[PDB]
Amino acid sequence: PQITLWKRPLVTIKIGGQLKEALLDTGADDTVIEEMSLPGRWKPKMIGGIGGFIKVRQYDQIIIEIAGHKAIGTVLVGPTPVNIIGRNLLTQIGATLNF
Amino acid sequence: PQITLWKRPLVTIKIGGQLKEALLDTGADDTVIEEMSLPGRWKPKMIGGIGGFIKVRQYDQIIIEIAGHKAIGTVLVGPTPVNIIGRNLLTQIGATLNF
Numbered sequence: 001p002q003i004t005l006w007k008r009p010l011v012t013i014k015i016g017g018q019l020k021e022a023l024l025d026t027g028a029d030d031t032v033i034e035e036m037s038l039p040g041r042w043k044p045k046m047i048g049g050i051g052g053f054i055k056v057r058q059y060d061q062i063i064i065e066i067a068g069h070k071a072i073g074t075v076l077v078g079p080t081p082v083n084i085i086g087r088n089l090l091t092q093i094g095a096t097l098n099f
Numbered sequence: 100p101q102i103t104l105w106k107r108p109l110v111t112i113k114i115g116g117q118l119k120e121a122l123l124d125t126g127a128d129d130t131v132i133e134e135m136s137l138p139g140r141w142k143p144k145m146i147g148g149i150g151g152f153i154k155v156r157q158y159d160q161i162i163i164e165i166a167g168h169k170a171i172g173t174v175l176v177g178p179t180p181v182n183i184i185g186r187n188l189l190t191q192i193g194a195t196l197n198f
């Protein structure tokens with residue numbers, strides 16, 4: 001779909017079998033999801049944002065549906081203000097910025 | 100134009116008489132530009148995201164050109180690591196997310 005930006009680009013995602021709401025974020029390199037239980041092994045990683053750096057759990061090759069679109073990639077789980085779908089998965093669903 | 104997301108969606112912007120590279124951020128409500136001595140009346144603001152918050156100066160009705168596209172709106176100036184074009188301006192240049 002074509003999504004305008006008058007409202008936050010929020011969509012329903014399905015991860016670990018659980019439905020969640022996430023923000024399609026072109027300004028995010030990666031996909032960061034709020035702390036949750038996720039099946040699989042993970043490795044400690046640190047990411048940055050506008051206010052600084054936070055520690056997250058890096059889960060690789062995670063199956064995730066984004067607005068009805070399937071993606072299999074890295075999902076960082078940690079204390080993010082918002083669940084955000086980053087470029088690693090946006091590219092997987094063929095998302096582009098247009099104007 | 101159409102911007103793919105393999106790489107950070109960075110574009111040239113013009114603000115306060117200066118040219119800069121800015122990140123088109125669909126996950127940002129507002130526009131945050133790197134610290135610069137912009138003239139005019141402003142109001143203190145605190146904005147956050149991953150890592151926490153940063154103090155910025157809110158300037159209203161600031162003219163900014165985004166990849167050749169003119170827009171006029173609120174620009175927050177402060178210690179941001181990257182120049183961020185948020186939805187307040189992305190909507191003005193007619194930017195959409197498509198997949």
Ligand SMILES: CCCC[C@@H](CN[C@@H](CCCC)C(=O)N[C@@H](CCC(N)=O)C(=O)N[C@@H](CCCNC(N)=[NH2+])C(N)=O)NC(=O)[C@@H](NC(=O)[C@@H](NC(C)=O)[C@@H](C)O)[C@@H](C)CC
Binds near residue numbers: 080128147
């Ligand atoms: C989490 C909050 C929602 C998404 C977030 C994404 N912001 C981009 C801004 C770019 C950095 C300043 C970001 O954090 N991107 C991260 C996302 C995390 C990630 N890992 O992808 C990123 O790409 N980080 C890279 C940093 C690369 C730095 N570049 C470099 N080293 N060369 C990274 N891999 O750690 N939005 C925001 O940060 C904006 N906040 C908001 O829109 C709202 N605030 C809150 C708390 O939700 C609103 C209520 O203010 C800021 C700019 C104020 C308008």
